[PDB]
Write a protein that binds this ligand. Sequence first.
Ligand SMILES: Cc1cc2nc3c(=O)[nH]c(=O)nc-3n(C[C@H](O)[C@H](O)[C@H](O)COP(=O)(O)O)c2cc1C
Ligand SMILES: Cc1cc2nc3c(=O)[nH]c(=O)nc-3n(C[C@H](O)[C@H](O)[C@H](O)COP(=O)(O)O)c2cc1C
Ligand SMILES: COc1ccccc1CCc1c(C(=O)O)[nH]c(=O)[nH]c1=O
Ligand SMILES: COc1ccccc1CCc1c(C(=O)O)[nH]c(=O)[nH]c1=O
Lengths: 313, 313
Amino acid sequence: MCLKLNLLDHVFANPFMNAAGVLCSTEEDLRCMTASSSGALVSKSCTSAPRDGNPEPRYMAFPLGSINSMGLPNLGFDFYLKYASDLHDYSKKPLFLSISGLSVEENVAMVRRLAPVAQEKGVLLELNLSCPNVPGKPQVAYDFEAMRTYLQQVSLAYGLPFGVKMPPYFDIAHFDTAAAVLNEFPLVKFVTCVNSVGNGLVIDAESESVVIKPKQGFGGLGGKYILPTALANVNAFYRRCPDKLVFGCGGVYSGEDAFLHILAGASMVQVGTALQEEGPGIFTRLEDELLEIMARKGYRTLEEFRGRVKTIE
Amino acid sequence: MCLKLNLLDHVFANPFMNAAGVLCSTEEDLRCMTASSSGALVSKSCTSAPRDGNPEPRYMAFPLGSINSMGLPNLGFDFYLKYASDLHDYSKKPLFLSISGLSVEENVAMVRRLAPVAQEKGVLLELNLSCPNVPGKPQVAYDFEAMRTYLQQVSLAYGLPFGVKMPPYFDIAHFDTAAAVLNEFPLVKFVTCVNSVGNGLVIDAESESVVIKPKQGFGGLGGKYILPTALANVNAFYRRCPDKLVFGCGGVYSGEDAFLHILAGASMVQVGTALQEEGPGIFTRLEDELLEIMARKGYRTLEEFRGRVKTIE
Ligand SMILES: Cc1cc2nc3c(=O)[nH]c(=O)nc-3n(C[C@H](O)[C@H](O)[C@H](O)COP(=O)(O)O)c2cc1C
Ligand SMILES: Cc1cc2nc3c(=O)[nH]c(=O)nc-3n(C[C@H](O)[C@H](O)[C@H](O)COP(=O)(O)O)c2cc1C
Ligand SMILES: COc1ccccc1CCc1c(C(=O)O)[nH]c(=O)[nH]c1=O
Ligand SMILES: COc1ccccc1CCc1c(C(=O)O)[nH]c(=O)[nH]c1=O
């Protein structure tokens, strides 16, 4: 019985990894993720220049999940490119590098310089499209014309297989349109579903106050709130993009939740809120828990059940 | 100490009512809601002709909420219009009728017939701007030009104050656009935020199956999963639509949850999943709980805290 996978010309001990943003901003964080039992890691979504992000408090967690308006804090592209080129030990596990430029030109600038390190070292690009562009316009992946432009320019600039981090969608027409945009780009080899459920609002009853400072308390939701949303997106893109991989992200706290993601179509399974809350020991727990469900069911490998969710009649 | 309020030229014993679709389809259901302690009731969204809806199972509930793809089952507009005009006891509480025609023309035809009953009896119109999926196009409230058409045509055809049931939005630009549409229409006097979080997917681990039959298991989410989404929409439209009332719906299981909705800006507070699961007894509990939290805080009226959620400076 085993959790091994072989995809994107890399070998993974198990499907688990951090979600971009969690335990991945500093060298210390990336060393910690590398030392963990995860099957891979992704570095913090970066911009060309370092960012301090938004004022605190900017993340808060609760029994059913988390809310954040971090402001994209990160150490800048050059730091994560150096980590990929010179510091990461690729004998331990594969590395993804997430980029999240605030314009198409910023993305292009970065991926031009990532390319030779991807080619030589095998770091894998995740492009965040659940990202602001022009204020007053929707985020990139909710603006299909912008999304197409970003994908065309990054495809041309980078020229190697990459993946994309998607926001959740809520309307069948959007699933259809979004997947058709993605399927225009052969270099998009994996699709990570999902980024946060956007612009939720947590209010504390005792204090009568919102719980984060930026955006008058509005921020993106993760955790137990979003697992059925996550599963729907994984399965919608799994069905619509038969020549791509889907990676699942949202609401994973247990091996059971991972099993559901995988039944929906997930290859890799990313862990955000739960990892932020529990720390990197979560990965040995998730592995044990998933193996125990597999043993009970008689499944020996992940491919035996991946995408095999049953529908009714 | 009592929770009685006046809105829309009606008096309400308390801000609670059912959410459209729950406990409101049949004459029996409407009589049960009328006999309850709720401050108001709303009828099942209707079409011009009766509908069977989708195959069963089409609703399921879980500790964190519910999923549904009912398919707009309803007894038809003539039945609900007769209920409003002949059967409802207005001395007990106000009645809202929800309309959800499958085209603008169908909505116009229903509202032209409702108008004189509204004038004579004081029934209130809630226009549902959510739709079965049509391939190649989004739900009406996610297509802003379609929404503007619907509202223009209904406003002209009806000519009296009405409200609109909205799906959740997840993007700040979308809140700005949606609210600007709604503010073009002076007759839209209340906005109900929110309908279900669209097209989630619940999967059962043991059976490895989806839990509802229609739409390959996809359906709208309610209950605990959606409370921060609901609060965000309530507050976003409360801030954007100062000349309208906002009715909150989503995630209410307790008086504290109602208190959060009202802090965010809600005038009435609708109860869907929790009502389906607990039954109409829930209304007495919710009242008791809300009054208890008001007493502990020193609030004597709802106006004292409605929309007064605090932000961090
Ligand atoms: C503190 C925090 C920071 C985040 N930063 C990013 C980011 O920089 N890039 C990105 O793609 N997603 C980011 N996300 C989103 C997560 O990658 C993930 O998509 C989301 O939290 C849902 O997964 P979960 O339910 O496991 O939390 C962040 C999430 C959190 C909680
Ligand atoms: C079984 C069921 C049927 C529903 N039917 C409708 C409907 O006919 N019209 C409508 O406006 N909303 C309908 N809804 C949505 C609810 O009114 C409500 O917006 C949603 O369930 C979120 O509230 P909750 O978290 O309290 O469940 C339905 C919900 C359920 C669970
Ligand atoms: C400036 O970057 C923003 C701002 C608001 C919302 C989302 C982003 C992109 C970065 C990001 C953030 C973030 O830094 O707020 N949080 C997430 O949950 N996911 C993300 O992808
Ligand atoms: C989201 O509304 C839909 C979805 C599919 C088919 C019909 C509708 C409108 C009626 C409705 C339904 C429904 O009858 O399925 N369920 C909801 O949660 N909200 C509704 O407003």
